[PDB]
Structure formats: C-alpha cells, structure tokens
Design a protein around this nucleic acid. Structure first.
Ligand SMILES: [Zn+2]
Ligand SMILES: [Zn+2]
Ligand SMILES: [Zn+2]
Lengths: 649, 1191
RNA sequence: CUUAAUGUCACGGUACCCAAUUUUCUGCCCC
RNA sequence: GGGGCAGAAAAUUGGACGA
C-alpha cells in the first residue's frame, strides 16, 4: 500500500527477527535500532497524521531496545529509562486516538502494560503501583490473557498476582504454558493458590537454572526481587532459595570476564547480604549441640569472603589492564586456600557489612580452639567519622591527627568484640579481611572504649589481607631503592653491607623491574590517585600500580619493607566494588609474601627506623616508637600507625 | 529591627517554577533548581525564597567565622548544630551533604534558650520557630521573600538555556540539562525584609549580608535600607517567486537577507545592492527582479520603510526566518527529535551525613582576584539551542519533536545582542585545564551524596568566576560548513549547515576568584598557559568547535590582586569584593587592601607547566605558497556589496582589539575547516581507512588522530590566513569562465560564470600562514602519518580552495617555521610520439569548421573508482608539459576591459589585454582543461555533457539520440571522459594547472602589438541542421589553416570599414612561444593514463586549439611532455611510455607503435586536428546549392 | 498569594562531539 | 545582416558505538 504501511511492515519484520532468541545478542541491538530509525523517520514526516499501528510499533520497538539495554551496576542506564518513557508516551498517544480492531487494541494494551511493568521495576516513583494495577486490569479485561502464545500476558498475570488479586480461572493455562519459565510457575503456585511445595521444587529448578545464566540476564534480578517478596511476609521458603541463589552466584561469578563483564554485572550485594542473613538466622535457631551452628558461622565466613575481591585475584596484559583502568572510570572499552588451613597461634577475623540489615559482622577462628563466632555492630557513625577524617586529611594532611584519634577511639566503642577475650584471645596473631569500608580503616590502631584504653597492636599482632584467596602456601640477600634528596635519609642505611645485586641510590623504575627475589626495601614518595594510578616517584617518571602489575615479576615471595608516603591508603574514601587498590596491595598481588605499607603521609625518620629494624627480615617497633601516646601527642600517633602489615605467612 | 534587603545581580541568574515541598519531588527540575529563584504563574511574578537567602547567609557566617577562628569583635562563638532527628524528627526541607567548617575549640558555654550565640540566634535555634507551616511571624530572626523592584510577561525576564557536562577522557558530553537564564540589567533587582529581635547579633547579620557572593548562581549585592505583517509579506514574495518558477533560490534570498544585517541601513536606503551586469537590461538574478510588479530592490526598500520601528537587525533576522520557514513549508518543515542518548540528567536520588572540617589555627588564607582580557585569537563559538526553544514556559516539547530554525548553530548573545561568554563554558575549560595540570582528577559526579575530594574538585569549590559580555553588539559573521563524501570527493547529501562565529579580537573581560590558603601551583600553570606572552601565543581553548579551530582565547592584560582575609576582611565586606566593578580594577593601579600579587611565578618556573600543560599542545606553524589564484566561494557574501561577482573569496572579519572597533579592511583566509578536512583526507587516503563500512568501535589511524563521532580530535587546526597581501596591488583578479557547448562550439543558454579569486603567480605566489596543534599522546607512527600528510600537501597533490581541477589553489611548497619541534622538523630527453597522421583529404568548396561523428554507443563504467585510499594497482603522479604555439595565441584578460586604453580614439570599443596575473603572462587552466576534455571525450566517444537543448529554429530535446545525453547521477553509469575529468557527484581524477611561458619571443608586432579582429557572431545551429528531418550534426571542431595573415594584413582595412565599436582588439602571442604547465592526476589506471598522454601529445603534425578566433586560425597549440612523474618520485622510462599508451590503445580498439588511423572516428578526429604547416557565404545555403551538408 | 528555619557545595555539570562551500564547465563564436 | 550568454543543476540537516 502506502509507504507508511511498507515501512511499518519492514519495522515489524526487523522487530520479529530481533525478538527471537535465535538472533545473537551481538547483532540484536543493531536490528532494533535500524527498525526504530525507520519508524521515527516515518514519524518525523507526519506528526499527527500517523496511524495508531505505527504508534504501537514505535512503542514495541522502544520496549525491545529497552529490554536489550541491561543495568550497568548500581545505576540504571538512562537510555533504558528514556526508551521506556518514549514508548509509554507513544502508546498513550496511540490509545488516545485508537482506530483499530480488537486485536490491535489487545496488542496496544499488552505493549503498554509490559512497558509499565518494566518502568515500575526501574522507576517506581513515576509509575506508581496503583496506576500499574489499574492499567493491568484494563488490559486483562480487554483480552490480554493468552498465555500460550503471548509471554507478555504471562508477565501481566504474574504482576497481578504480585499486586493482590486472584486468578483461580487462569492457573490452568499459566502452568501448562510452554513459554512460562521456572519463576513464572513459582509465582503462580505461591500466589494463585498460596502453596509452598510445588513452588519449592519449581524454585529449586530455578536455582539449578541460574547456574548457567550470565550475571547480566534479567532472571537474576527477578529472583532477587522474589526473595525480597518472600521476605516481606514471613515465609519459610526464602531461606533455601537465598542459599541456592548464593551458590549459583558463586559458581557463575567465576566464568565471566574481568575486562568488560564484572564491574557492572556484579550488582548483587543485596543477594550476598541476604544470603548472609539467611545463614545467620539459620544459625540463630537453637541447636541440640554445637556441631552445626558452630559450622554455619564458617558458612557465614565464606559468604563474607566470596564477595570482597574477585577483580584483583585474576589480575598483551598491558592493553587489558589499561582497558580495566578505563572501565573503572565509567568509560568505554574497545587453588583457593582452605579457611581451616591457618597456622597455629593465628586467629583470622572475617568481615562483612550488611546493607539490608544495616549492621556489620565479624567472624573469628581460633585455630587452637577450632571455634567460629559472630557478633553484630553498627556501621553508620563509623562511616560518618571515617569520611570526616578522610576529608580533613585530604584538606590538611598532618592536622588530621585528632581525627585519627577520634576514629580509632570510636572504632573500639562500636566494635568492642576486638578486645573481648572470648572473641579474639590475647597473644594470638590477628589477620583481618575487611569489606569495602574497613579496608581504609586503621583497625590495627583501634582503641578500646575504656578510661585509658590501649591499642589493638599493643596486645595483638595485626596483619591485613584484602581477601582470603590472597593467602597461599629464596635468596638471603637484601636490596635498597632510594630516590630521596641527598640531604636527608642517609645515616648508615645507604651503605651498611646491603647488597651488590640491585642496591641503588637515585634509583629508576627499570631498577625495580630487575631484582632476584630479595626482601626489597623501598624509600621513595607516593601520591595516590583520586583510580589505581597511585604512582611511585622513581626516576624516569615513576612506577605505577599499572606498571607494578605489568612488569614487576621478580619480587615473588619477598618481604617488602616499602616505606613510601601514602601507599596503603591509596584507594579513595568511597567504595565501588569492595576492591582494594593500594600499591602495597599490588605488590602483595604480584607475589609478595608481606608488605609493610604506609597508609598516609609518613616521614623520613620513621621510614629509616622501620628500615633499621633488621632484627628479623614491626608491631613491637610501633609499640616502642610511641604509638601508645595517642592521648599525649596526636602528631606522633599520626606518623606511627601509618605503617600496616599486609600479607599472610 | 526590620531591615530592608535588596538585590543587584551582575550576571545572568536562573529561576525555576514554584511547585511546593510536596510537589518538588514530582518534578525533577524543581528539585534541581532548589538553589534557584522561584517563578509563579498568575505571565507571572518572580521572587526568591527567604530560606534560600537564609542558607546563603548561614554559609556566609560559618565561612566568615571560620576565617577569624570563631572570634568576632570579642564575643566567642560555638560550633552550632546541623544535625536533626536526634530525639523526635521533623527533618528540615533541605539536606546539606556538605563539609561543614568546624572549629578548633569554640568553647564558651553550653548555650540554651537564655544566652544563644550570635551564630545560633542567626540560625533561629532557641526561638518559637517551627518546621511545619509557620502559623505566625514570631521568629527571633525572620527572612522574608525578596520581590522584584504591571504583571510582566514571562519571556520578558528569562530565556531558556541548555547547560552541558563534557567528559574529560572523551570530548563527547554524556548528558545535559535545561536552564532558565534570566536578566541582570533591568529585572535583576529584588526587594525584601529581614527582622532581628535580638540586638546582640546585628553585626554578624550585616557582615553576612556584605559577605555573601553566591545566590541563584550569580554574583549579587545585598543592600540595606510587528511580525504578523512580515509573515504576510514573506508569503507574498515567496508566492510571487514561485509564480516565476524560481522558488529553488528563495533560501539564498533568506541567507542574503540574514547576511544583510552586517551592512548598515545604506545598503537598502542608498540602493547599494548589486545592479547586475552593466548592460544586461535584466538586473541581478536575485535582487533586481520584480515581485508583484515592483522591483525587489525597491520592494524591500518599501518593506523596510514600513518597519523602521523594529530596527534593521530585527527586520533582517525576522525576514530571513520567515522566508526560510515559508520555503520549508513547501520544499515539509524539517523537524529534529533524537531517539536515545538525549540524557537530561539531574540525579534526584538517605545517608544524611555530617562532616566537620577543622582548619588549623593560624592558617594564612587569602582570596585572589584575577582581572584580565580574553582576546580571541581565533573566531569563537558558544553553543546555544535554537530560538523558540529557549522560550521559557513552553518547555517539555514529552515525545514532542522540535522545529529547525534558520540558524543550525546559534551563538550565545544577550538580550541586547552582544556576544556573551558564559560562566559554565569558562568553568568547564578551567576544569579541563586543571585536570590536565594535576594529571589526576575525577569525572564529575551528579547527585553524589558526599563531596569529591579529588584535586581538581577541591580547587574549583574555592573558585568563583563571573559572566562577561563583549562591548560589541554587532551581528556575527556566518561561517558555512560542508561535508565531503570520500567515495566521490563531493558533497555528502544533506550535509550543509551554518555556523555563527564571532569576530576574532574581541576583548572579553576575564574575572577569576580563588578563595584558599595558598594560590595553587596548577592554577598558576593554567593562567600562564592562557597568557599571551611574547611567544606563549595564548592557550585558553575556550568554547566549542575546538577541532575546527574555534575558541583559542589569548588571555592578556593580566593583573593579579589579593585581599588578606585573616586581617582585611572588613574591607572585603565594605567593598563587596568589588563584584560587578571588575572593570575599575584594570585602570586602577586602588581600594583599601587588595595589594597586587608580586609572587606570581613565570612560565619557566612552574613544574606542572612543563610537566603536563606545555607539551599538551605543540604548535606547528607553517606557510603555504600557491602560485595560482585561490578561491573559497563565499557565494552568500557575494550576493551583497558592489561588484556583481558571482563567487567572491572568503574574507575573515577581524576586530581590532582595543583599537577603533572593527577593521574596515578584510582579511582573506582559507577556512580552518578546509585545513582540517584536507589533512584528514590526506591521512585517510594514506591509511586506507576512509570509506570504511562503519566506525562503530573502530580505532584506526584516523579516528585516533582526527577524532570521531564520539572521541574528540587530538589535532586542532586554525585559519590558513594570507600574509602576502601588501605587495600585490591586484590582490583580486577577475577571471571569466564560460561552458562551451559541444555542438554549437559557443556559450550555452546559461553558462557564463565569473569567478573572483585572489592573485598569485609562479613569480609571486600567495603566502598562506596557518598552524595546527598536536596532543601529547602520539606515538611515532601517528606523527609520521601527519608528517607524510603535510609532505603530500607540499608535493601538490591536494589543492586548497575550490576549482582545483582548473588550477586554483595549487601549492608551490611549504616552509616549516623554525619554532616547530625538532623531531617533527627533522623528519619532514622529452618523450615525443612518433605517430604521423597524413591527413591527406586534400593535400593540394571549403568548410568553416567541420563536424565530428563518433556514434551513439557509450561505455558506462558503473564500477566507480572511489576517491578513497590510493589503489595499489592504479598509478598516481604528476605530468609536466611544454606548450608551444604554431599559430598566434589570443587569450584576453576580462578583468580590465580597457587594458589597451584605446577608448580615447573611439569610446565604446572593447579592447582587452592578454591574460596575466601579477604581470606574469599566463594561460588560464580552464582553457587547457576544456580543450583536452573535449579532445578526450571525442577520442573515447564519451558524451555531450554540455548540450544546448530547448531550441527549435518541436522536438527540441528529441533531435539528439536518447543515448548520448549528459550524465545523471552515478546510478546510470559514468563515461570514461566522465570517469577521468569528473562530473557532478564525482570529482575528477585529473587536475590541470596554469601555464607560465618564461621563454620564447615576447609579442607579435603589426594601437600597438595588438591586431584587430573581425566580428565573432553567435554560432547558428540552424545552419548545421537546416531541415528537421536531419537527426543532429556531431561534435564541432575547428581546422588549423593560417587565416590570421589576412587579418594581420588588412588590419586597417577592417578596423574602420565596418563595426567601428562592435569589434574587439586585444594583444596576441607570436608563433613559437614556449609555455609550461602541470597536469596532475590521482588514482588512474593504465589505459586512462595512456589515453590522457595520447590526448596531450598524439604525435607530430597534430595540434589543438585555444583562445579566440579558432575559425580565424588563431590559437593553435603544440604540447610536449618532459617528465611523467609517478609515486606509489619515480620517472617512467622514455621508451615511448610502453605498457601505458599501448594498453590505452588495446582497450580503445574494442570500441610496435599503434595505428590510430584504423579507427574511423579517431581518424576523423585527428584529421580535424592536422596542421599542414611543418613544410609547405549566402549562395551555399540555397536549397539548390547543397541539400546534404556533411562533415 | 509567596518561602518555611537546630542542614540548599547545583559556581555540582563547556550544547559538547563528528563531517574540505564544494563537485561539473575553454570569454567564447557566422548566416 | 547594426550580437547573444551573463550562470545553471544540486546539497542547505544528517547525527551522536555501553556491554
Ligand atoms: Zn551556641
Ligand atoms: Zn572531584
Ligand atoms: Zn558522460
């Protein structure tokens, strides 16, 4: 017929060829964009003389381009929201002047309803659930019921059973429909008939199904939403599905790519948080004996550990790592150690912050006692004072000694289990595994809430580790790399029979890349960026976290005594993915057995004293220097606890 | 004590719709514009909330008291309170999420509702003030609303704006947002009341009023105690134009009317519009035509006589817009609407955190004020959305498609139509420069619950800079831009648009304020980078279209001052920081305090300067010499100003900075867009990436260097201006071009075209100066590629300007300036055919000029050889030629119709002079191009590309066979002649040049040295085809018999016997004058080059024709080849150019030395070009004389 | 009729980015 | 036999790679 009808038919053909799963997602977006080019080009030449069929076609094309746009992390893409808004406006204009048959009305109302479903899922404030319910009722009373040949009708029925109305006359078609997936059947059994058994095996079938679906596919978000729905009204079924969704998420977030598939598809902090909740409340129930409850706290420990840092673990290579750093800034890119294998006299403290529950967690493990325990605490005022110190230190470096005192004093007040004998007994070495907020906190300098409370390093040996898989199961020489001015930091450390292999004065970046696995001692300046571009002020520009990952292949197994200013606290104040991006972390990642990195700005004398500590190649050094005088002189507390022990022996 | 508070805004501020605290969440704009003024609908009234000025005063008092360590004339102050919901709730309507400045001790007493501190009482802590509605004016301190000082209409106070957010790693901006920019001149004064019941804190309140400098996004002071008839006329004129079937050129009338605003009222009152040709008796094709009877030159005069009230600027702009819209309605009006990626983001987004920031006691804080002048070394652009979109109130137009206005790219002008430099653009440029200097910054986040503590963000939180307006309220010149199709080296379809650029040299005042503890090293680096020192040249890339080269501001007259905030804050309060009085600081050399900065570091003292900013952009200034006329074809500007020149050269309109306004003398230049495009095409053709299927995720050697649809360009160009103009005295040379008919041999029905380019000769070329910048991220390969592109420019392959095929803009060389980087600077006999054609038709009645028949068959090469990267198989290079004349050559110079100055003896007698530029005798390139193109077309029976149809004495177009018609678009196919010399939608692959003699005898001696001529009457096609029964005669050619001796003998016997004033007499060459011209070629096959060679020098005893008097024997030319340079420079062997001409003959034969006489049409062609001089009109037309006249 | 007060960094955001005013034409000629 | 031609045909809005 007219050019309008021909172009509409072409758009329909393209939308059909892009909707089916047979079309690869690589060449799926382009087809939708081409069809929508045709549709909007047709619309631009006739603003109001346009038929309702073209309006509903444009709405469907906008829906299709919206569903193929996937969430990019903690923030929903704005192209998806714009596509939904345009589609809903176009379908509203279609139904305002509808001039079609009954089938056309059915299709228009179905498209509008599914667009409203996705818009409510994305932006609930604009399209509230009451108007969504009204639109869904108007759609279903107009014939939007066919579940055998229209999956959108299945979505509408599921949303209705969410909303709180009965469909006893539709379950027969809902369950026998081939298009319905495991989640649709689970919703049908849980809401239509208020059953829990058939819902349970269909639910476990869904759990098994998630083991192969990528983290980008919407079924993960649907499952998490359904778990929250089961959590809203107290149910006994969300425990098991939380556990199995956790298991599937672990087995799946091991095959995705770090380059362009992990920053913005691991949006499942809620999932791990609520799996932690499920395990905790299962362990909260009374048990006949301490043999399973004591073992569920270990499961809590793996809940905490499996989410912290997976980007760093799997870190030419330079091009891929440059792609990674580009993708960090929201730009465009073109075995594991057993937790029970801990040396004697060592206690490991795992950490997790629950965003859903609003409380923190702490999992300990006394190797001698073989005991796992958990305690709760708040993390809001801690975040307050952490940001306070970080801001007042960025503005005024050394003047933030008072804020170090305040933060470390209130850490013990809000975290009293650190000094508790039952939680962490005296004497045993403590290894910390923080979660996205406590990494930057100097937990080794935590001050007990007492009248004259001492430190944590005073009565324990602290060691930091970004995760648990970092720990894993040489030459006796020593090397020194110095790039300070030849006016200070000389003493006898420059020439005290260090080593003829690679000890240098005014060293360059290339020198650090040619070492023979020695306990490298490094005394230069670092800056810290914001990304993980925290440079080290070697000659010829300097070596960066990028360069440390790419080039340094000689410091494997070394005990680095790196004393550069602002090394351990390189990562910014706010968290993104619970990944620690310090220079000391980089050295630990490339294969070092331990790094005493400096958190904030340090001084030459302190670095020399740490270097002079050649008793055995720390904490006792911190005790001797005057780290216990935080209440007598905050300035000397500023320059002492900056050095922290990173690594596991 | 009631205190009356007034406002005086000194830069355009913003206002938003009222809504309400419950309704602010529903509308994202209202939530975004909480810190903006409020607008109401009653046209409506405007005001600002007392809570907003309350928040400003609270920030002022907290910062002011932190400045003085919490002590203010004796009374100590405490920390105050900014945390709510500690006991019950009722959260404040506003959330801080800002680093509150807290104090060292601030320990005086635990203040309660008996002895509230001055800051506490200003906060209204212990009063009866609530947080629900009000219900009474019982506040201890009250901040009432401030109202403007007759139901004013909405648009009269505000105009919409679209601010932007440009990414740093890329150049693309990810998102934008709306804005309701208001006026600060007339509707910029507000009026309100503030009450203070407690007398104990009046001083703090007055000090806060004097200290606040941030309100509604604008610097402010606190004071205590028609077109309807034009639419009809446009419709009338458009309808009248359509009635003449001349509606196609109504938009150029709209563009001409829009350009006419640059000229004063005298262009229409004094009738200064071009009068057309002197004796045309028809007038200009656009101006001097009749609309509804009356002449348009007078019709527009009457229309303006009815419209004095609006003004010349408004009248011209409205007339142009109305004409454009009426044309668009009957071309539909083009409408624009994006699908996606039009993100209008505000980040509406409760952590409700509180961060106390304690500065060390005794910190030395000072507030530096920067005053200067932002001279635009290049034309500047500041993007503003189209008119009727910037109208406030008529927004949200949701899935609505907007209407395209006349100007595709507007520039930011204020209400009085003077160029304005916005706060946002300069702030963004400062952000980019600061991030470059630091090397570590944050991509700005929107709606972030906690302030960014990155280096660049900290220093801009203490930077405030004011909007500036240039004192030049004069219309902006319009710089058109076109897009070239790499496939055919022609215009991309639907890819023409206009750009509104301001004149270079305008003095924008520059104000920058830094309120910190130490003047940052990086800001000093930025200022020195922006400074226009002796050799710094200024590096403030400010504005948009930086890739083209628009917006390079050169900061000058820089003066740095500073108050001492710790001890001289009362002076700051008293003089209000001199906000709005920024001009007075330039002349002064001074108020109390404000000692000038003496510790301002120099350029070669700043470490971050040399580290990051100095290498950031490396200038490469180089001069291009062209020995040929240069033309840029500013056609719209040509339809104005006296001269009646169809295509004048593009002239920049420079503005003298500080001098007496604008410079009357123009500055001819090549557009920076042309320079950028020529370099981009060079790298694309040398890299093989032009013409690619798509550039979706491409990372080729062109997207990286010259940017792409998403990334910014890493190389920014500039204007290729002319510096050799003061020693010409004939800078503009008038050259005429006429399209010769292939049948009649004369001018077509509509073919005359006069071009008006610059001067330029091999002995006096034009020195074109221009520069381009290089980003400090290029490896060796990219710099090598750009150097090879520059060398290819030097080698002469790519001609600047237009009509490069004729020879315009042919470069003679490049001289790199000595200031270029060292790495860049260091890295940058004759063949005579032995063929002899006897031509023995009659070696021992006559015909004037016999015709040539070639047949209707034609081969159309549908596989067009694209103008993309050079084909490896194909051969590209240069041809040098030696030109000699067997008969005297006559080529007039129309630029001076009285060159011989012989009008005294007989006025009205045309007397031309031989063509020459700058006094160097020269053959125009068009002559050689048309000559050899006609020769090649007849050789290959190409087509009749130029044909004079629509003539009877029916079947005006049916006489010619319907197979050899002039070629349409590429769909049908292109002739070999059309494949080589080109056509519309396909640029030719062979470019011709200009012939310089520099040899042989001087002139011909017979008014001196110039023999007269007979009357050259119009060609008559009727004689060639007498009867309608005949189909058509073929191509017409002229013989070579020396009839010029008859004219040289009877010169006096014909210059007075007949045609006393109808004849033309111009000087001629002599026999055996040796010329030299170059015939370049790009991407030619073997047989193409062979056939071109045989067209140039087919062999001995064969010569072409040039100039006037071809039937009279004048102008026969002999061409010889010196060197066939070819690059894939290499000289091909002189063995008769084997495998090139031979392959040409081999491919021609379907349609040892070869035998051209075997082919019949080739035989006739070469007979018509035989020269028998190496060694030794009414009775004919009778019906009984010769019915069948043949060729 | 404005505003709501023990919390407004929106000076918290360059209308930014991409595309050569060009392709084609002998100041020329007889009934 | 007391010249014609002085331009014409266009193109004057197409856009704007997130998995
Ligand atoms: Zn107080
Ligand atoms: Zn920042
Ligand atoms: Zn042709």
């Amino acid at each position: 017929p007219t050019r309008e009808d021909i172009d509409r038919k072409e758009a329909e053909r393209l939308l059909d060829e892009a909707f089916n799963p047979r079309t690869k997602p690589v060449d799926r977006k382009k087809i939708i964009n081409s069809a929508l080019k045709i549709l909007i080009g047709l619309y631009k030449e006739k603003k109001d003389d346009l038929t309702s069929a073209s309006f509903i076609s444009i709405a469907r094309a906008y829906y299709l381009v919206s569903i193929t746009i996937l969430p990019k992390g903690t923030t929903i893409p704005e192209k998806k929201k714009e596509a939904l808004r345009k589609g809903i406006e176009f379908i509203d204009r279609a139904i305002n002047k509808f001039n079609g048959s009954i089938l056309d009305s059915q299709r228009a109302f179905r498209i509008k309803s599914v667009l409203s479903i996705e818009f409510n899922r994305i932006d609930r404030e604009k399209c509230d659930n009451i108007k969504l319910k009204n639109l869904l009722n108007e759609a279903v009373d107009k014939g939007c019921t066919d579940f055998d040949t229209y999956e959108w009708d299945i979505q509408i029925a599921i949303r209705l059973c969410e909303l709180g109305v009965d469909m006893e006359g539709h379950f027969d078609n809902l369950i026998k429909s081939n298009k319905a997936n495991d989640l649709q059947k689970a919703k049908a059994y849980y809401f239509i008939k208020k059953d829990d058994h058939k819902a349970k095996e269909h639910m476990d079938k869904c759990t098994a199904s998630l083991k192969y679906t990528p983290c980008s596919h919407r079924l993960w978000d649907e499952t998490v939403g359904f778990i929250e729905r089961l959590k809203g009204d107290s149910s006994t079924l969300w425990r098991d599905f939380a556990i199995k969704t956790y298991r599937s998420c672990r087995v799946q977030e091991k095959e995705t790519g770090t380059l362009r598939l992990r920053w913005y598809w691991s949006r499942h902090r809620v999932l791990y948080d609520m799996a932690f909740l499920a395990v905790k409340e299962q362990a909260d129930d009374e048990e006949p004996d301490v043999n399973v409850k004591q073992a569920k706290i270990k499961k809590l420990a793996e809940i905490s550990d499996s989410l912290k840092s997976r980007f760093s673990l799997r870190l030419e290579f330079k091009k891929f790592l440059d792609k990674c750093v580009t993708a960090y800034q929201d730009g465009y890119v073109i075995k594991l150690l057993e937790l029970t294998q801990v040396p004697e006299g060592w206690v490991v403290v795992h950490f997790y912050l629950n965003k859903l529950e609003g409380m923190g967690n702490a999992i300990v493990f006394d190797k001698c006692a073989n005991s796992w325990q958990y305690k709760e605490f708040q993390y809001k005022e801690l975040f307050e004072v952490f940001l306070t110190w970080q801001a007042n230190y960025n503005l005024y470096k050394e003047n933030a000694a008072e804020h170090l005192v305040t933060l470390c004093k209130k850490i013990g007040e809000t975290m009293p289990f650190l000094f508790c004998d039952n939680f962490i007994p005296n004497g045993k070495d403590v290894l910390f595994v923080p979660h996205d907020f406590l990494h930057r906190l100097p937990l080794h300098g935590s001050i007990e809430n007492k009248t004259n409370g001492k430190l944590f390093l005073e009565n324990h040996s602290c060691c930091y580790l970004p995760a648990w898989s970092f720990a894993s199961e040489t030459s006796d020489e020593y090397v020194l790399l110095k790039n300070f001015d030849q006016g200070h930091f000389e003493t006898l450390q420059n020439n005290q029979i260090w080593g003829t292999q690679s000890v240098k004065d005014g060293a360059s970046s290339d020198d650090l890349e040619n070492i023979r696995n020695n306990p490298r001692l490094l005394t230069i300046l670092c800056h810290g960026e914001a990304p993980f571009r925290s440079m080290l002020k070697l000659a010829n520009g300097g070596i960066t976290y990028l360069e440390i990952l790419n080039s340094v292949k000689g410091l494997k197994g070394s005990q680095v005594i790196l004393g550069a200013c602002e090394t351990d606290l390189v990562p910014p104040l706010s968290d993104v993915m619970d990944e620690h991006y310090s220079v000391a972390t980089a050295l630990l990642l490339i294969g070092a057995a331990g790094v005493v990195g400096t958190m904030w700005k340090v001084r030459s004398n302190k670095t020399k004293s740490l270097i002079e500590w050649k008793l055995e190649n720390l904490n006792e050094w911190q005790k001797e220097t005057g780290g216990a005088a935080y209440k007598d002189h905050p300035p000397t507390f500023y320059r002492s606890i900056a050095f922290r022990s990173i690594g596991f022996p | 004590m009631n205190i009356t508070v007034e406002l005086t805004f000194f830069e355009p501020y913003r206002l938003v719709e009222w809504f309400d605290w419950d309704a602010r969440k529903k509308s994202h704009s209202a939530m975004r514009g909480q810190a903006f003024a409020q607008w109401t609908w009653k046209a409506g009234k405007s005001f600002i909330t007392g809570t907003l000025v309350r928040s400003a005063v609270i920030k002022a008092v907290e910062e002011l008291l932190s400045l003085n360590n919490g002590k203010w004339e004796g009374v100590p102050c405490c920390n105050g309170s900014f945390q709510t919901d500690e006991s019950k709730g009722k959260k404040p309507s506003f959330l801080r999420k800002r680093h509150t400045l807290q104090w060292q001790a601030n320990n005086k007493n635990i203040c309660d509702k008996e002895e509230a501190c001055p800051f506490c009482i200003l906060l209204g802590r212990f009063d009866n003030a609530g947080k629900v509605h009000e219900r009474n004016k019982d506040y201890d301190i009250h901040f009432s609303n401030f109202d403007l000082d007759n139901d004013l209409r909405l648009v009269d106070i505000a105009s919409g704006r679209i601010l932007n957010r440009v990414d740093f790693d890329t150049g693309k901006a990810k998102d934008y947002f709306r804005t309701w920019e208001a006026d600060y001149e007339t509707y910029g004064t507000y009026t309100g009341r503030i009450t203070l019941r407690n007398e104990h804190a009046k001083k703090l309140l007055l000090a806060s009023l004097g200290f606040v400098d941030k309100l509604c996004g604008a610097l402010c002071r606190i004071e205590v105690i028609h077109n309807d008839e034009l639419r009809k006329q446009a419709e009338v004129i458009v309808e009248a134009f359509k009635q003449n079937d001349k509606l196609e050129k109504i938009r150029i009338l709209a563009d001409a009317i829009r350009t006419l605003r640059l000229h004063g009222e005298g262009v229409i009152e004094k009738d200064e519009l071009p009068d057309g040709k002197e004796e045309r008796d028809k007038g200009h094709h656009l101006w001097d035509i009749k609309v509804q009877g009356t002449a348009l030159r007078t019709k527009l005069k009457e229309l303006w006589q009815s419209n004095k009230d609006i003004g010349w600027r408004k009248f011209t702009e409205m007339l142009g817009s109305n004409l454009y819209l009426i044309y668009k309605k009957e071309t539909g009006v083009s409408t624009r609407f994006r699908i996606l990626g039009d993100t209008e983001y505000y980040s509406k987004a409760g952590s409700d955190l509180f961060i106390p920031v304690t500065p060390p006691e005794g910190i030395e804080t000072k507030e530096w004020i920067i005053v200067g002048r932002l001279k635009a070394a290049t034309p500047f652009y500041f993007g503003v959305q189209q008119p009727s979109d910037s109208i406030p109130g008529k927004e949200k137009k949701e899935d609505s498609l907007v209407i395209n206005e006349h100007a595709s790219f507007n520039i930011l002008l204020d209400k009085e139509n003077r160029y304005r430099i916005p706060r946002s653009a300069l702030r963004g440029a400062l952000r980019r420069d600061l991030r470059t200097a630091f090397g570590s910054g944050c991509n700005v986040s929107l709606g972030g619950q906690i302030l960014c503590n990155c280096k660049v963000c900290i220093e801009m939180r203490r930077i405030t800079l004011k909007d500036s307006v240039s004192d030049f309220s004069e219309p902006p010149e319009i710089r058109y831009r076109i897009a070239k199709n790499p496939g055919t080296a022609t215009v991309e379809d639907g890819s023409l648009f206009d750009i509104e650029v301001g004149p270079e040299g305008l003095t924008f005042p520059f104000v920058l304020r830094y309120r910190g503890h130490k003047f940052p090293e990086q800001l000093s680096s930025v200022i020195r980078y922006w400074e226009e020192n002796d050799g710094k040249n200024g590096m403030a890339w400010l504005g948009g279209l930086d890739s083209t080269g628009k917006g390079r501001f050169a900061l000058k007259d820089i003066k740095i001052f500073e108050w001492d905030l710790n001890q001289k804050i009362n002076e700051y309060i008293k003089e209000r920081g001199m906000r709005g009085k920024e001009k007075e600081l330039l002349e002064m050399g001074l108020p109390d305090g404000l000692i000038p900065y003496k510790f301002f570091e120099e350029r070669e003292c700043l470490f971050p300067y040399k580290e990051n900013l100095k290498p950031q952009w490396s200038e490469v200034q180089y001069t291009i010499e062209v020995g040929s006329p240069l033309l840029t074809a500013d056609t719209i500007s040509a339809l104005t100003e006296p001269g009646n020149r169809a295509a004048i050269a593009y002239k920049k309109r420079v503005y003298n900075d500080g001098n007496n306004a604008i410079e009357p003398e123009p500055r001819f230049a090549v557009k920076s867009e042309t320079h950028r495009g020529i370099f981009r095409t060079a790298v694309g053709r040398r890299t093989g990436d032009l013409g690619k299927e798509d550039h979706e995720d491409c990372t080729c050697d062109m997207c990286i260097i010259f940017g792409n649809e998403h990334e910014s360009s890493k190389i920014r160009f500039e204007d290729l201006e002319l510096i050799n103009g003061n020693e010409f005295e004939k800078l503009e040379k008038h050259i005429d071009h006429v399209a010769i008919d292939r049948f009649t041999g004369g001018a077509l029905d509509k073919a005359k075209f006069d071009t008006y380019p610059l001067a330029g000769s091999p002995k006096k070329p034009l020195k074109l100066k221009g520069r381009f910048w290089i980003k400090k991220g290029f490896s060796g390969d990219h710099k090598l590629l750009i150097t090879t592109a520059l060398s290819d420019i030097r080698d002469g392959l790519y001609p600047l300007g237009s009509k490069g095929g004729v020879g315009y803009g042919w470069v003679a060389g490049i001289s790199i300036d000595d200031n270029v980087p060292d790495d860049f600077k260091e890295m940058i006999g004759p063949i005579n055919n032995d063929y002899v054609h006897p031509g023995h038709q009659s070696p021992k009645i006559y015909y004037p000029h016999y015709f040539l028949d070639s047949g209707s068959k034609v081969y159309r090469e549908k596989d067009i050889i694209t103008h993309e990267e050079f084909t490896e198989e194909l051969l590209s290079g240069k041809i040098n030629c030696k030109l000699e004349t067997l008969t005297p050559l006559i080529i007039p110079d129309t630029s001076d119709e009285n060159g011989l100055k012989l009008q005294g003896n007989k006025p009205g007698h045309k007397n031309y002079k031989f063509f020459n530029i700058n006094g160097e005798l020269m053959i125009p390139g068009s002559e050689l191009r048309g000559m050899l193109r006609t020769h090649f077309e007849a050789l290959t029976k190409s087509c009749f590309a130029i044909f004079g149809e629509d003539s009877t004495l029916k079947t005006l177009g049916g006489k010619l066979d319907k197979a050899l018609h002039p070629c349409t678009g590429l769909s049908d196919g292109l002739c070999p002649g059309c494949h080589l010399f080109g056509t519309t939608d396909y640029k030719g692959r062979v470019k011709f040049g200009f012939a310089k003699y520099e040899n042989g005898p001087e002139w011909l001696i017979t008014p001196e040295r110039s023999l007269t001529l007979g009357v050259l009457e119009s060609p008559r096609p009727a004689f060639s085809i007498p009867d309608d029964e005949s189909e058509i005669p073929g191509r017409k050619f002229y013989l070579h018999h020396n009839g010029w001796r008859i004219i040289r003998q009877k010169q006096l016997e014909i210059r007075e016997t007949v045609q006393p004033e109808r004849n033309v007499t111009t000087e001629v060459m002599d026999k055996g004058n040796v010329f030299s011209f170059d015939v370049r070629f790009e991407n030619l096959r073997e047989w193409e080059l062979g056939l071109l060679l045989q067209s140039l020098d087919p062999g001995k005893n064969i010569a072409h024709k040039l100039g006037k008097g071809k039937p009279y024997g004048f102008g026969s030319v002999k061409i010889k080849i010196d060197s066939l340079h070819t690059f894939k420079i290499k000289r091909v062997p002189q063995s008769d150019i084997r495998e090139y001409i031979n392959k040409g003959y081999q491919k021609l034969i379907e349609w040892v030395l070869p035998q051209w006489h075997v082919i019949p049409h080739i035989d006739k062609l070469y007979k018509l070009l035989w020269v028998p001089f190496l060694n030794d009109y009414k009775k004919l037309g009778d019906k009984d004389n010769l019915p069948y006249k043949t060729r």
